[PDB]
């Protein structure tokens, strides 16, 4: 299904408004969903919209709710999302971390009682666009079994790190090898995973998206490493925000809401000259892309650079949205 | 080879002295090498000592050199290691990041022209011990190929994250599924890797440590994820320290030195109350340990939680060092 940016945003806005969402609020939220999609993020973009509306209709999200600062300690601030829309609030919280960084060199915003932020990379990116280094992560409801377990007691807790390079270089990675959104992406494309993504019915590792989605025995990135990192990320998000951890959300909430997120921005321009910054970054990037290809028919690519190329491709040939997903939205 | 703490430290000290290291710096450095080993870290403890000595002789390291502050911007500071000893200087810089977080809520020291810091978890641990969240990383010489390539163009750039929980929960992970240090540990112990360690020469994945050490085709942890994270960590360390990146080091250096490192300390006690901190953290940890197991006899262990038993056991039973390694060390004299 080929659709234009305008078409996609229209569909998002209509559904939002029909659900009782404020005017400008629906338009703001719809904008982010369409932007994330046009940038090449379908998993946490258009494909996640249906699930988003569901949680909104269930009351998990409070449309008119707004972020409220709780504690101000210089470069550090603790905020209460008040169960407001995840992507709109996150965008605002990362913008605050940036403001703090502009004055303290570094800014950290710890947010509790938040809702799923959709694409964590959105915030890392907005930081990098402003010339800052962007770092953020979130916790979630138990959807991953810690290494050694078969029951979910850990979160996917995506970690984002973005650099103000040209093009912008950025990682946005789930602690699970494949986030659930990417498992769906592969299933919708009718393909199997390129590497192990989980375990089957109490068995060995499998590459079948569907099987993993059902039993939820999703494989942690790097086994014990991803599992471990997820846990420490949850701890930091829980402590600094004095909010709910993966355990608290999974045991005290009906669904995935009231989660904790961390937003960091680090000023660069005062530590290194602009020309030199661009020069050293270029050296690193060329050193990577000029490497010996493992497959001559496959150019080497820097993390996050597809968000620049895919965007150019989309604003030219239009946006391809999975038919089942589009039909799902239209049905709304 | 079962040796006591002082005996192990004594060996490290002897060699350092014979290489021009002054008494005070030799004792402190020897102390760290012994401590890291006693804590259960051999890959970057005693087993890495010989390599350290060689780099010292080649002039990579400048024994009497000390860290120097270049710029002070509140919570953030840029320092120059001046090619000083890596572990000793890294300890001082994380200690600086901590002091900074004490007054600014957060602290970040960007360090350039540094040497290998041995065990990253040492610095994460220092922060956690003082009640702070500790995060730190470093870049290295090209020893790993970026995703999509076969030629080494990126570093293992270990990432450390330590939490002031009881017991301390900490991750110290190489961007490669297995650091070269851990490959050696498995090789000395004589055994295969639990998972894919890398692509065997002109081949596919493999679990043979020795082979991976050859072609250096070490597999990045999480494939494109470990590769990508390695690169962004390299960029941050390079930029904030206005120092050398993996590319610069590999291209303009005879070996692994003049590296860039980042030390972060985050204050906790001002954002959350003591009892609330202990309670929430305990809920997190218990939620993990009580997870239904894949193997009923195999407990679910939290990252870093193994250091308690490793330390307790070494302090009363003694420290067990690899015979070949212990010999290579004495041979240095």
How far is B15 from B103, CA to CA, in rounded Å? Answer: 40
- CATH code for position A193: 3.30.60.50
**Residue A300 within any structural domain of the chain:** no
Contact B145 A294 (CB under 8 A): yes
Residues A259 and A200 occupy one common structural domain: no
Q: Which two tokens stand for residue A190?
A: 């009718």
Question: B128, B139 in Cβ contact below 8 A?
Answer: no
Distance set, CA B222 to CA A94, A173, A195, B141, B195 (Å): 27, 10, 10, 20, 12
B104 is catalytic: no
Close Cβ partners of A213 (under 8 Å, ≥ 6 residues apart): A180, A183, A184, A187
Confirm or deny that A170 is annotated as ligand binding. yes
Sign of CA dihedral A167, A173, A178, A179: negative
Residue A160 lies in a domain: yes
The CATH code of the domain that includes A45 is 1.10.1530.10
- In 3D space, the residue among A99, A151, A134, A160 whose CA is nearest the CA of residue A268 turns out to be A134
Same domain, A48 and A188: no
Test B147 with A268 for CB contact under 8 angstroms.
no
Rounded Cα distance, A222 and B319, in Å: 30
- Check if the beta carbon of residue B245 is closer than 8 Å to that of residue A280: yes
* Identified catalytic residue from B9, B35, B44, B92: B44
Q: Say how far apart CA A170 and CA A160 lie, in whole Å.
A: 7
Same domain, B171 and B183: no
Residues 6+ apart with CB under 8 A from B7: none
B168, B258: one domain: yes
A291 within some domain: no
Where residue B94 sits, what CATH number does that domain have? 3.30.1370.60
CB-based contact A291 B145, cutoff 8 Å: yes
**Interface touch B235/A281, C-beta < 8 Å:** yes
Domain boundary among A189, A220, A251: A220
- Could you tell me which residues of B are annotated as the binding site for NAD(+)? 168-174, 224-225, 304-306
| Opening angle at CA A155, ends A152 and A157, nearest 5 | 165
Q: Where are the alpha helices (DSSP H) in chain A?
A: 5-18, 23-38, 49-57, 86-104, 121-129, 180-188, 209-215, 224-241, 246-252, 274-289, 306-317, 323-331
Helix, strand or coil, per DSSP, at residue A80: strand
The number of beta carbons lying within 10 Å of the beta carbon of residue B275 is: 8
Does residue B43 share a domain with residue B7? yes
Q: How far is CA A285 from the centre of its chain?
A: 24
d(CA A116, CA A213) in angstroms, rounded, equals 19
Which single residue is written with the structure tokens 């090619």? B83
Name the one residue in this structure whose structure tokens are 């602690």.
A175
| 3-state DSSP percent of chain B in helix, strand and coil, to 5 | 45, 20, 35
Within this chain, do residues B117 and B249 fall inside the same structural domain, yes or no?
yes
* B135 Cβ contact partners less than 8 Å away, ≥ 6 residues apart: B124, B159, B160, B161, B162, B264, B265, B266
Query: Is B293 a domain residue?
Result: no
Q: What SS3 class is residue A182?
A: helix
Cis peptide, bond prior to residue A140, ω within 30 of zero? no
- Tell me the CA distances in angstroms from B225 to A252, A300, B138, one per residue in order: 32, 14, 17
On chain B, the residues whose CB falls within 8 A of the CB of A147 are 300
B102 neighbourhood in chain A, CB within 8 Å: none
Provide the CB-side half-sphere exposure for A289 (13 A, CA): 12
Give the integer Cα–Cα distance in Å for B321 and B68: 35
CB B220 within 8 A of CB B205: no
Q: Please, is B297 exposed, middle or buried when counting C-beta atoms within 10 Å of its C-beta (0-12, 13-18, 19+)?
A: exposed
Cis peptide before B167 (omega within 30 of 0): yes
A117 known member of a binding site? no
d(CA B323, CA B248): 37
CB-CB neighbors (< 8 A) of B302 in chain A: 228, 231
**Nearest-angstrom CA–CA distance, A141 and A251:** 9
Distance CA B259, CA B239 (A): 12
Is A171 contained in some domain? no
This structure was determined by: X-ray
How many alpha carbons fall within 13 Å on the CB side of residue A279? 9
Q: Is residue A312 part of a domain?
A: no
User: Do A126 and A193 belong together in one domain?
Assistant: no
How are beta strands A76-80 and A106-114 bridged, if at all? parallel
Q: What element of type H or E holds B95?
A: helix B86-104
Q: Given phi > 0 = left and psi -120 to 50 = alpha, else beta, which region is B202?
A: left
CA–CA gap between residue A81 and residue A90 (Å, rounded): 9
**What span, in angstroms and rounded, lies between the C-alpha atoms of B252 and B244?**
9
Q: What does the alpha-carbon distance between residue A51 and residue A106 come to, in Å, rounded to a whole number?
A: 35
Nearest to A306 by CA among B251, B33, B228, B215: B228
* Same domain assignment for residues A55 and A82: no
**Rounded Cα–Cα distance for residues A311 and B1 (Å):** 60
CA distance A89 to B285: 29
Q: Name every residue whose Cβ is closer than 8 Å to that of residue A122 and which is 6 or more positions away in sequence.
A: A32, A35, A36, A87, A90, A91
Q: What is the number of domains present in chain A?
A: 3
Domain presence at residue A281: no
What b/e string do you get for A140-153 counting C-beta neighbours within 10 Å, with b at 16 or more? bbbbbbbbbbebbb
Closest chain A residue to the Cα of B302, Cα to Cα:
A228
- Check whether residue B104 and residue B17 sit in a common domain: no
Whether residue B56 sits in one domain with residue B6: yes
- Rg of chain B, C-alpha, whole Å: 20
Check: CB of residue A146 under 8 Å from CB of residue A153: yes
Helix, strand or coil for residue A108?
strand
Range of the domain at A327: 2-64+317-332
Please enumerate in sequence order all residues whose Cβ is within 8 A of that of B167, keeping only pairs 6 or more positions apart, or say none: B304, B305, B307, B308
Q: Name A72's Cβ contacts closer than 8 Å, sequence gap at least 6.
A: none
Name the helix (H) or strand (E) containing A72.
Answer: strand A68-73
Residues B58 and B137 in one domain: no
B91 Cβ contact partners less than 8 Å away, ≥ 6 residues apart? B32, B122, B123, B126
Token pair recorded at residue A187 = 């299933």
Look at the alpha carbons of B220, B221, B223, B228 in this order and tell me if their dihedral is positive or negative.
Answer: negative
Cβ-contact B248, B260 below 8 angstroms: no
Given an 8 Å threshold on Cβ–Cβ distance, is A104 in contact with B104?
yes
Buried b or exposed e, range B34-46, using 16+ CB within 10 angstroms? bbbbbbbbbbbbb
Q: Which residues does residue B79 pair with via DSSP β-bridges, in sequence order?
A: B69, B111
Coil, helix or strand for B258? strand
Of A11, A12, A37, A44, which is the active-site residue? A44
The reply to whether B79 and B160 lie within a common domain is yes
A154 in any annotated domain: yes
- Find, in chain B, the residue whose alpha carbon is nearest to that of A177: B222
Q: What is the DSSP letter of B298?
A: S
DSSP-derived secondary structure letter, B324: H
Residue with tokens 């239209």: A330
H-helix or E-strand spanning residue A259: strand A259-266
Q: Which tokens sit at A288?
A: 């990577």
Buried b / exposed e across B65-90, counting CB within 10 Å, b at 16+?
bebeeeeeebbbbbbbbebbbbbbbb
**A279 → chain B, closest CA residue:** B239
Residues forming a β-bridge with B138: B261
Q: Are A261 and A111 in contact (CB under 8 A)?
A: yes
């Amino acid at each position: 299904m080929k659709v234009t940016f305008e078409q996609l945003k229209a569909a998002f806005n209509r559904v939002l408004i029909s659900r009782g969402v404020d005017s400008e609020t629906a338009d703001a939220c719809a904008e982010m969903f369409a932007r994330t999609t046009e940038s090449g993020v379908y998993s946490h973009g258009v494909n996640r919209f249906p699930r988003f509306i569901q949680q909104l209709e269930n009351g998990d999200i409070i449309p008119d709710a707004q972020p409220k600062r709780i504690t101000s300690l210089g470069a550090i601030e603790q905020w209460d999302a008040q169960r407001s829309i995840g992507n709109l609030t996150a965008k605002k919280m990362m913008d605050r971390a940036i403001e703090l960084a502009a004055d303290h060199g570094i800014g950290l915003v710890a947010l509790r009682n938040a809702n799923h932020w959709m694409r964590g990379g959105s915030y890392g990116w907005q930081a990098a666009e402003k010339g800052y280094i962007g770092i953020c992560w979130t916790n979630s409801i138990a959807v991953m079994p810690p290494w050694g377990a078969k029951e979910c007691r850990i979160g996917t807790n995506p970690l984002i790190v973005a650099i103000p390079s040209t093009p912008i270089t950025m990682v946005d990675m789930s602690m699970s090898m494949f986030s659930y959104g990417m498992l769906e992406v592969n299933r919708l494309a009718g393909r199997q995973l390129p590497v192990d993504g989980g375990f089957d019915d109490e068995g060995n590792l499998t590459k079948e998206p569907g099987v993993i989605e059902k039993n939820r025995r999703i494989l942690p990135m790097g086994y014990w490493k991803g599992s471990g990192m997820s846990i420490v990320l949850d701890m930091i998000a829980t402590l600094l925000s004095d909010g709910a951890s993966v355990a608290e959300v999974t045991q005290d909430n009906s669904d995935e809401y009231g989660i904790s997120q961390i937003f960091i921005a680090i000023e660069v321009d005062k530590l290194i000259d602009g020309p030199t910054r661009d020069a050293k970054l270029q050296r690193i990037m060329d050193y990577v892309t000029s490497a010996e290809r493992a497959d001559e028919n496959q150019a080497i690519r820097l993390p996050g650079h597809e968000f620049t190329t895919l965007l150019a491709e989309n604003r030219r040939n239009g946006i391809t949205v999975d038919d089942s997903v589009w039909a799902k939205i239209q049905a709304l």
